[PDB]
Amino acid sequence: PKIHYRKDYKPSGFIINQVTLNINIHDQETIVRSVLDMDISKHNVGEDLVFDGVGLKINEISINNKKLVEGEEYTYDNEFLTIFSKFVPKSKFAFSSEVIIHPETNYALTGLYKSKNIIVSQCEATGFRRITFFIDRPDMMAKYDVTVTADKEKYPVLLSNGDKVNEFEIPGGRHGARFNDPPLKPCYLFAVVAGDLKHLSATYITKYTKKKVELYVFSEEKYVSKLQWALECLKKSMAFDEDYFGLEYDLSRLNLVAVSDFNVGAMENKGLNIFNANSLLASKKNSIDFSYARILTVVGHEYFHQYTGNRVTLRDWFQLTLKEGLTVHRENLFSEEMTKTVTTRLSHVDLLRSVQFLEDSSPLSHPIRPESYVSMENFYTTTVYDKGSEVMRMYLTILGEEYYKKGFDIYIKKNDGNTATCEDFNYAMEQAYKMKKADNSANLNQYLLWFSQSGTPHVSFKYNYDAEKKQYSIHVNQYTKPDENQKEKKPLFIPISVGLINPENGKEMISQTTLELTKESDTFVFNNIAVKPIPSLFRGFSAPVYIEDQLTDEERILLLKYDSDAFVRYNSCTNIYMKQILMNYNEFLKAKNEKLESFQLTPVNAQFIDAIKYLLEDPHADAGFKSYIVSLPQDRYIINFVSNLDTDVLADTKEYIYKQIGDKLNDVYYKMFKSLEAKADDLTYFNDESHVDFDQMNMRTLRNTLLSLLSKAQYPNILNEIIEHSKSPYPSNWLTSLSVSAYFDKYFELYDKTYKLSKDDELLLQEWLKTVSRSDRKDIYEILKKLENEVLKDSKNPNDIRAVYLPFTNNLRRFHDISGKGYKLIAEVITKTDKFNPMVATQLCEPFKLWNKLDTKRQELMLNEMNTMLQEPQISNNLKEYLLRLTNK
């Protein structure tokens, strides 16, 4: 296993100036001819010329049109092509090759492959070497001249990067298209697509240069009616980058293409963005609400890459977070502006603190710029993406919008057209910091520790108020636990956005304030504070940390009801829930351990339940926010706080708490479920795909959340409401009716009904699979076996496999069955998937990430399955590497 180290970066001894490709797609094979116009760099030391080339069948290779001979002048081992240095020219030369590849049987979906009837590439990170020989690293920038030929009937639409400069007929029913893309790019941004594609199009006129840009969105013919929202989102994305960042698209055309088989969400190939169909296609009849926010975010994300990743690219793969963290941050700003709902920010926090915090306290923990890797296919993590985004967002918090924009422009103007590193961005932000602070001695050197230090900081507080002096102090401490990456952790630059709430009237007592904590601890003092305040801490979730607010539940309730910041209200509620959860968990655990015949549980705080009722009944309060306060914290958030977590005890704990609150609020829940119906399910714009109302979708989220709570509670005659809900035109509603019917003998009647509604749309059927997989059923294992035999079968579509199995792994009681049979089942699926798609097999490992946090029996069960997978003779590099790190070997 070759380990690559960040510290070892060195420029290549070679240069590739021009790539000229001919890609000839045939029935049983694709022939790729490539001419590379090359040179010797100032770094050359007479080394052999080594190309990346994986799984290529060589027809011939030449230098300066002289055919090379295998053995004598080169060797190829199916991974590297080595040309012995004595045969490498000492000035500009042409390297040429012709190889054969087989997209039809490329089920790993990397390189050039076939998805249904579409030929499509995926080159990030090191997939270009699966198409032709190359020095496959992002600092090898070159111009591309690409010709694609193919059967015209099967593949009428041909696309690649750049301008289409020729189209031509070929004998025997074939045709070709030539694309020239003069700006330099790294090879991971190369793309080609061939297929019988249908489209929608529009023209966008840029804000300042007034350039006309052609926008095309493509899919297979069957789903062309699902393209409209994506096109609207693309327009919105272009406008936002123009309006917030002053950035305009500078190419003549941008193509978005949906394919059914894709390892991730989408890919920002220059001028030719390629999408998982589930992240591009939607219609109100055939998609759940979540698709609309998903398409907005993924279209936005790929568009924002045009500057942050494409025009400014990466020196090397260790800089990944420079394009991904920064582009997620740009997409978050975009989606917050487009949706205008507080739940947008809250949902990104929720994701970070459950999934990313779990990663950062697991054996997989890494900084957002790792020091090493074995597999790039495993490198695209929530740490790099989501913690990266929070680190990119902290610059905006620290600088404020005016100076952040100044700093961002410096970054773009200094690095446009080049490779860049994380230091380049920090440098640009630093220039703005000096300006904001009005002194050139100010620096952000400490800030760089956010790129290198792993683990989640813990921030805790003590307060003091002098009533005579009208003086309030906030004493703050930070602490990162030592881990495998750093024995000694250093204090970070932590920005703490704060407010001070007057508890008598709920009003703000100070102006907007961001505390700059740069030491292990500091005390922040405020004068002229007329009454003891309740502090509103880390407003907007201003740093990616464990917050320990040291507030009473009474104080947290006051914030939940009256604070101005959505995150702090949501966090205060979260903290009340966590205090209850840990208390009840320990009470149940002790009863279990001691085999007690009787015992007591601490009830849920009554004033807390009253506060939930208060907010729920407030007609001017936000529906999405309301759905968060009636939901307990995510299991994967909770597990970061409990050692040797007994999943059964936690399930019992959650049930007790929900039942406590429902016993008080169920009539309120029901009343709201009924009163919300008219607005939530309004059909006025059902046949307008341009019209998307995120408040209305949040109202449906609330109804569907309440319906779930009422169903579990077996609220009187709630099955009537369930049956009626199943007749709604909105899939979010009728799929909810399936999952909440789990608690009734009508489940399989609804199973069949919703199957019939879903089966004729590929993406809708995937949503139906997810709904079944996640169903709270005692017979869920039998149900899963039925899905396998009747629907999934031997599909190699990652969306199908992920839909059937991942939601089930969140079934706290059943996936974690003490027999270990859920662990055994997912490990079988992982091993089976690893035969043809190692990247997706490793994604299917996600349930095991928390293995060493569970009770010792479940730890042992999970470890046994992971060691079983590790012992498979045919295990991929991806899966082996991942499982070795995860099991601490």
Ligand X SMILES: O=C(NO)[C@H](NC(=O)[C@H]1[C@H]2C[C@@H]3C[C@@H](C[C@H]1C3)C2)c1ccc(-c2cc(F)c(F)c(F)c2)cc1
The interface partner of residue 264, options being Mg ion, Zn ion, ligand X, none and the CB cut-off 5 to 8 Å by kind, is: ligand X
> Cβ of residue 524: shortest distance to Mg ion, in angstroms?
38
The interface partner of residue 239, options being Zn ion, ligand X, Mg ion, none and the CB cut-off 5 to 8 Å by kind, is: Mg ion
Number of neighbouring beta carbons within 10 Å of residue 647:
21
> Cβ of residue 329: shortest distance to Zn ion, in angstroms?
11
C-alpha span between 362 and 885 (Å, rounded): 10
The interface partner of residue 267, options being Mg ion, ligand X, Zn ion, none and the CB cut-off 5 to 8 Å by kind, is: ligand X
CB nearer to ligand X: pick between 305 and 885 = 305
> 586 phi and psi, to 5 degrees?
-70, -30
What track of x and - describes contact with Mg ion for positions 233 through 262 (by CB under 5 A)?
------x-----------------------
The interface partner of residue 244, options being Mg ion, ligand X, Zn ion, none and the CB cut-off 5 to 8 Å by kind, is: none
CB nearer to Mg ion: pick between 101 and 498 = 101
**DSSP symbol at 3:** P
Tokens standing for 548?
A: 């320990």
> Strand (E) positions, 334-457?
372-373, 419-420
Residue in 41, 443, 521, 888 binding Mg ion, rule: CB under 5 A: 888
CB nearer to Zn ion: pick between 330 and 770 = 330
Residue of 92, 97, 180 whose CA lies nearest to 133? 97
Would you call 714 helix, strand, or coil by DSSP?
Answer: coil
Residue in 178, 305, 348, 366 binding ligand X, rule: CB under 6 A: 305
220, 232, 302, 721: the active-site residue:
302
What track of x and - describes contact with ligand X for positions 90 through 119 (by CB under 6 A)?
--------------------x---------
CB nearer to Mg ion: pick between 136 and 145 = 136
What track of x and - describes contact with Zn ion for positions 315 through 354 (by CB under 5 A)?
---------x--x---------------------------
CB nearer to ligand X: pick between 266 and 830 = 266
Q: Give 669's strand partners.
A: none
Of the ranges 311-319, 374-382, 498-506, 563-571, which one interacts with ligand X (CB under 6 A)? 374-382
C-alpha span between 622 and 618 (Å, rounded): 9
- Ramachandran sector of residue 309 (left: φ over 0; alpha: ψ -120 to 50; beta: rest): left
For the chain, the helix, strand and coil percentages under 3-state DSSP, each to the nearest 5? 45, 20, 35
Q: Which of residues 652-671 bind Mg ion (CB under 5 A)?
A: none
Residue 124 among known ligand-binding residues: yes
The interface partner of residue 528, options being ligand X, Zn ion, Mg ion, none and the CB cut-off 5 to 8 Å by kind, is: none
Q: Is residue 650 a contact partner of residue 812, using CB atoms and an 8 Å limit?
A: yes
Is residue 871 classed exposed, middle or buried when 0-12, 13-18 and 19+ CB atoms within 10 A define those classes?
Answer: exposed
C-alpha span between 635 and 654 (Å, rounded): 9
Would you call 413 helix, strand, or coil by DSSP?
Answer: helix
C-alpha span between 639 and 439 (Å, rounded): 45
Q: Residues in contact with ligand X, total (CB under 6 A)?
A: 20
Q: Tell whether residue 632 is a contact of Mg ion (CB under 5 A).
A: no
> Cβ of residue 126: shortest distance to Mg ion, in angstroms?
15
Number of neighbouring beta carbons within 10 Å of residue 162:
22
Residue in 181, 248, 289, 324 binding ligand X, rule: CB under 6 A: 324
CB nearer to Mg ion: pick between 207 and 532 = 207
C-alpha span between 556 and 828 (Å, rounded): 46
> Cβ of residue 414: shortest distance to ligand X, in angstroms?
23
> Cβ of residue 794: shortest distance to ligand X, in angstroms?
21
CB nearer to Zn ion: pick between 159 and 322 = 322
Of the ranges 76-84, 121-129, 232-240, 386-394, which one interacts with Mg ion (CB under 5 A)? 232-240
The CA dihedral of 813, 815, 821, 825, to the nearest 10 degrees, is: 170
Residue of 428, 225, 249 whose CA lies nearest to 326? 428
> Cβ of residue 622: shortest distance to ligand X, in angstroms?
25
Q: Is residue 144 a contact partner of residue 162, using CB atoms and an 8 Å limit?
A: yes
CB nearer to ligand X: pick between 266 and 639 = 266
Would you call 208 helix, strand, or coil by DSSP?
Answer: coil
Residue 305 among known ligand-binding residues: yes
Residue in 24, 122, 237, 381 binding ligand X, rule: CB under 6 A: 122
CB nearer to ligand X: pick between 383 and 741 = 383
What track of x and - describes contact with Mg ion for positions 347 through 366 (by CB under 5 A)?
----------------x---
Would you call 108 helix, strand, or coil by DSSP?
Answer: coil
> Would you say how long the chain is, in residues?
889
HEC string of 863-881 equals HHHHHHHHCCCCCCHHHHH
Residue in 52, 241, 377, 761 binding ligand X, rule: CB under 6 A: 377
Residue number, nearest CB to ligand X: 265
Q: Tell whether residue 812 is a contact of Mg ion (CB under 5 A).
A: no
The interface partner of residue 93, options being Zn ion, ligand X, Mg ion, none and the CB cut-off 5 to 8 Å by kind, is: none
C-alpha span between 409 and 420 (Å, rounded): 15
Q: Is residue 516 a contact partner of residue 495, using CB atoms and an 8 Å limit?
A: yes
Q: Residues in contact with Zn ion, total (CB under 5 A)?
A: 2
Burial pattern 57-69, b for ≥16 Cβ within 10 A else e, equals ebeebebeeeebe
Q: Tell whether residue 55 is a contact of Mg ion (CB under 5 A).
A: yes
**DSSP symbol at 812:** T
HEC string of 137-191 equals CCCCCEEEEEEEEEECCCCCEEEECCEEEEEEEECCCEEEEEEEEEEEECHHHCC
Is residue 186 classed exposed, middle or buried when 0-12, 13-18 and 19+ CB atoms within 10 A define those classes?
Answer: buried
Residue 265 among known ligand-binding residues: yes
Residue 390 among known ligand-binding residues: no
Q: Confirm whether 302 is a catalytic residue.
A: yes
> Cβ of residue 294: shortest distance to ligand X, in angstroms?
9
Give the residue numbers marked as catalytic: 302
Annotated binding residues for a peptide, written as ranges, equal: 124, 265-266, 268
Annotated binding residues for Zn(2+), written as ranges, equal: 301, 305, 324
Instruction: Summarize as ranges the residues that interact with ligand X (CB under 6 A).
Output: 110, 122, 124-125, 127, 263-268, 301-302, 305, 324, 376-377, 380, 385, 839
Instruction: Summarize as ranges the residues that interact with Mg ion (CB under 5 A).
Output: 55, 239, 363, 484, 888
Instruction: Summarize as ranges the residues that interact with Zn ion (CB under 5 A).
Output: 324, 327
